[PDB]
Amino acid sequence: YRSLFQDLELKKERRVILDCERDKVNDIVDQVITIGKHVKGYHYIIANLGFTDGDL
Amino acid sequence: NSIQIGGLFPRGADQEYSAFRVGMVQFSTSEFRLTPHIDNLEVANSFAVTNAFCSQFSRGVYAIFGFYDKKSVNTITSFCGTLHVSFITPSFPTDGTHPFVIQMRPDLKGALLSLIEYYQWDKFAYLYDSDRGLSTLQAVLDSAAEKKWQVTAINVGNINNDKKDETYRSLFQDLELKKERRVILDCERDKVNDIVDQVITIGKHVKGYHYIIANLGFTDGDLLKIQFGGAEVSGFQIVDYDDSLVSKFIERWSTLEEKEYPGAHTATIKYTSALTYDAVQVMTEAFRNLRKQRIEISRRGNAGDCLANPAVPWGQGVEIERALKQVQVEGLSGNIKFDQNGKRINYTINIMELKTNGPRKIGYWSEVDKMVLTEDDTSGLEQKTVVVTT
Amino acid sequence: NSIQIGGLFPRGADQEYSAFRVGMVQFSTSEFRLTPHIDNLEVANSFAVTNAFCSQFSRGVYAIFGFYDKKSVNTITSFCGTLHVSFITPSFPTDGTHPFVIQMRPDLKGALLSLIEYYQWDKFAYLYDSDRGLSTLQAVLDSAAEKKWQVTAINVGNINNDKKDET
């Protein structure tokens, strides 16, 4: 993941649409927390019906 | 030879009690047996402290040992300053000089000062908890007078566990008005971890922020949770794990069964417990020094009431302190020496920093040599400063 | 109905004890009269404090009176809290809600902050002794954060009286 989001930094992406399973959503959000890219200036879109179901 | 001593401990200080028994095992000798008198009374109640104190005084103990509250420190100083009973302590150093008050915890403030001196901060927020005493705050303010600092001190410690939440978000929002990038936390490890977690949740651990954790437990707390945030983090370590004696300590410390010694079966250890384990060594070293001096100390154990008026000090106990301060041996904290006031001297503390690979030392702060960088430091961005012919 | 009471007057506080005598005069009544147990001991010495305290406790006095040091506040609070014995003081108020504690000093900090607001100050020095406690310091700093101020606090009180001039 850290290798992955670093790659996003080269494009300096501020905008990402995740499309993953309830569990993968959790792990991804967690890693985003650890790398801290949940700060203002980023944005996300969770492509599933479980958006409320997720532990946001 | 039986040698009775006290054994005060706060409830929930299990690691320290375990390490204490470890001290009893490691340094036991046929020449004499130490005779601990364990008491797990709460530190919060000064009256209870008085109770245990008079109780062990009835025990006729030649020494007493344990932690103390900021609320309780004056009591211990009063009695030990009264009955001339020596008292070693892991806890924070006394703000004032006292007789019979040995203290295991190195003064920390000067290293903090030099640390700020290195980063050359002009202005910063300063959180603190009342329980360790505000003396550090008095120090940083005194420095602020000379060094011209616009420090913003705040106590977080009044907050309830029940609503320790919005109070934080409200707090850091207040920091935003000054747009502070630089804050020194000064809290106990639990509230340390909580505040760190809140910093995580609010996300203010990205690059461009910085922190300074004012305690010896800088490695003891989790930092993995914030290691990757990009904000720089640095602290202190009284206990180098790299030390051969220390790694040797780890070799067995891991081995101990969790049942018999809870909290002990781990790769690491809190510095405080380490200070306890060292303290027992110091005590025993002192008693070994006494018998060699052939100094009789067999005072009657029937000391009677500690409230006795007039209170009469027993002289051999007064002599004991004279040995205690003069004692010098290695410990988990490394070399230890005392002043005539019983404060620690000739000590030095490692300056930790967290890095993406993991935590690392960068230098050491002597009390006399102040800050001293290691040569371990590498280099900056060498672009070969692009040579340009003309 | 004579009623035994404690008496813990710090040494050198003569005017206070005299005022106590006047108080005994003004309110004396046939229904009951107080029975002071007057003592003049150092307020700093928590040991002696506990000594006289348990001494009057042996008397089983139904009330106790005297001052307390910042060093000793924890003592008397710990005892009245433990022994459930009433006590009265004119010493500076505790920061916490302690049972069986009476105190004649109104809190002064809010009026102080108010006075600050009246002058609409933004920056100032703040000399302080450590004796009455740092509560006012914590307060003025708290207001300093919110009101956006520039405190310059200094602990004058630790200075030795011998060279007390050069400092």
* Pairwise CB contact (< 8 Å): C145 & B152: yes
Least Cα separation, residue A34 to chain B (angstroms): 6
**Residue B154's Cα: distance from chain center in Å?**
22
Helix (H), strand (E) at residue B142: helix B135-147
Angle between helices B271-292 and B14-26 (to 10 degrees): 30
Experimental method: cryo-EM
Residue type, B59: R
* C-beta pairs of A48-53 under 8 Å, 24+ apart in sequence: A48/A19, A48/A20, A48/A22, A50/A22, A50/A25, A53/A22
Q: Which residues of B touch C144 (CB under 8 A)?
A: 152
Give φ, ψ of B159 to 5 degrees.
Answer: -65, 135
Q: Length of chain A, please?
A: 56
Return the residue matching tokens 């008095």: B138
**Residue C36's Cα: distance from chain center in Å?**
20
Return the residue matching tokens 């609503």: B163
Residue type, B349: I
Return the residue matching tokens 């150092």: C42
- For C88, counting Cβ atoms within 10 Å of its Cβ (0-12 exposed, 13-18 middle, 19+ buried), the class is middle
HSE-CB at C61 with a 13 A cutoff on CA atoms is: 23
Helix (H), strand (E) at residue B268: none
Are A and B neighbours with ≥3 CB pairs closer than 8 A? Answer: yes
Q: Are the CB atoms for B274 and B332 separated by under 8 Å? A: yes
Of C81, C146, C153, the CB nearest to B174: C146
C99 touches chain B (CB under 8 A): no
Chains in contact with A, where contact means 3 or more Cβ–Cβ distances below 8 Å, are B
* Pairwise CB contact (< 8 Å): A38 & B225: no
Give φ, ψ of B8 to 5 degrees.
Answer: -65, 135
Q: Are the CB atoms for B171 and B195 separated by under 8 Å? A: no
Q: Positive or negative CA dihedral for B187, B193, B194, B200?
A: positive
A15-32 burial code (b ≥16 CB/10 A, e <16): eeeeeeeeeebeebbeeb
Size of interface B-C (CB pairs under 8 A): 59
Apex CA C42: angle with CA C37 and CA C45, to 5°? 110
Q: Which residues of B touch C148 (CB under 8 A)?
A: 177-178
Tell which residue, B167, B105, B176, B177, has the closest CA to residue B136: B105
Locate all alpha helices (DSSP H) within B70-134, ordered by sequence.
73-83, 109-119
Helix (H), strand (E) at residue B13: none
Apex CA C34: angle with CA C30 and CA C40, to 5°? 155
- In 3-state terms, what secondary structure has residue B269? coil
Going from the C-alpha of C21 to that of each of B281, B297, C27, C43, C65, the distances in angstroms are 57, 51, 10, 21, 14
Give φ, ψ of B43 to 5 degrees.
Answer: -80, -20
Least Cα separation, residue A3 to chain B (angstroms): 12
Chains in contact with C, where contact means 3 or more Cβ–Cβ distances below 8 Å, are B
Tell which residue, C85, C87, C81, C84, has the closest CA to residue C104: C87
Of A2, A38, A39, the CB nearest to B228: A2
Q: Which residues of B touch C84 (CB under 8 A)?
A: none
DSSP conformation letters of B220-243: TS--TTTTTSB-EEEEEES--TTS
Q: Which residues of B touch C141 (CB under 8 A)?
A: 152-154
Return the residue matching tokens 């009623």: C3
Tokens (6 digits) for C40: 């003049």
B150 touches chain C (CB under 8 A): yes
Tell which residue, C55, C71, C73, C77, has the closest CA to residue C4: C55
Least Cα separation, residue C15 to chain B (angstroms): 28
Rounded to whole angstroms, how far apart are CA atoms A38 and B13? 38
Residue type, B294: R
Q: Is B12 left (phi over 0), alpha (psi -120 to 50) or beta?
A: left
Rounded to whole angstroms, how far apart are CA atoms B63 and B86? 6
Cβ under 8 Å to A: B residues 197-236: 200, 203, 205-206, 225, 228-230
Give φ, ψ of B271 to 5 degrees.
Answer: -65, -30
Cβ under 8 Å to C: B residues 288-307: 307
Rounded to whole angstroms, how far apart are CA atoms B64 and B67? 10
B210-213 and B182-185: which strand pairing?
A: parallel
Rounded to whole angstroms, how far apart are CA atoms B236 and B312? 43
C48 Cβ contact partners less than 8 Å away, ≥ 6 residues apart:
C41, C42
**Residue B179's Cα: distance from chain center in Å?**
32
Q: Positive or negative CA dihedral for B65, B68, B71, B73?
A: positive
Are A and C neighbours with ≥3 CB pairs closer than 8 A? Answer: no
The alpha carbons of chain C give a radius of gyration, in whole angstroms, of: 19
* C-beta pairs of C23-27 under 8 Å, 24+ apart in sequence: none
Tokens (6 digits) for A41: 């200036």
Neighbours of C96 (CB within 10 A): 10
Locate all alpha helices (DSSP H) within A1-56, ordered by sequence.
2-10, 22-35
CA dihedral C91, C93, C97, C102 (to 10 degrees): 40
- For B151, counting Cβ atoms within 10 Å of its Cβ (0-12 exposed, 13-18 middle, 19+ buried), the class is buried
* Pairwise CB contact (< 8 Å): A33 & B200: yes
Q: Which residues of C touch B48 (CB under 8 A)?
A: 82
Cβ under 8 Å to B: A residues 37-56: 38-39
Rounded to whole angstroms, how far apart are CA atoms B215 and C13? 42
A6 touches chain B (CB under 8 A): no
The alpha carbons of chain A give a radius of gyration, in whole angstroms, of: 11
A34 touches chain B (CB under 8 A): yes
Chains in contact with B, where contact means 3 or more Cβ–Cβ distances below 8 Å, are A, C
Rounded to whole angstroms, how far apart are CA atoms C155 and B188? 25
C116 Cβ contact partners less than 8 Å away, ≥ 6 residues apart:
C140, C143
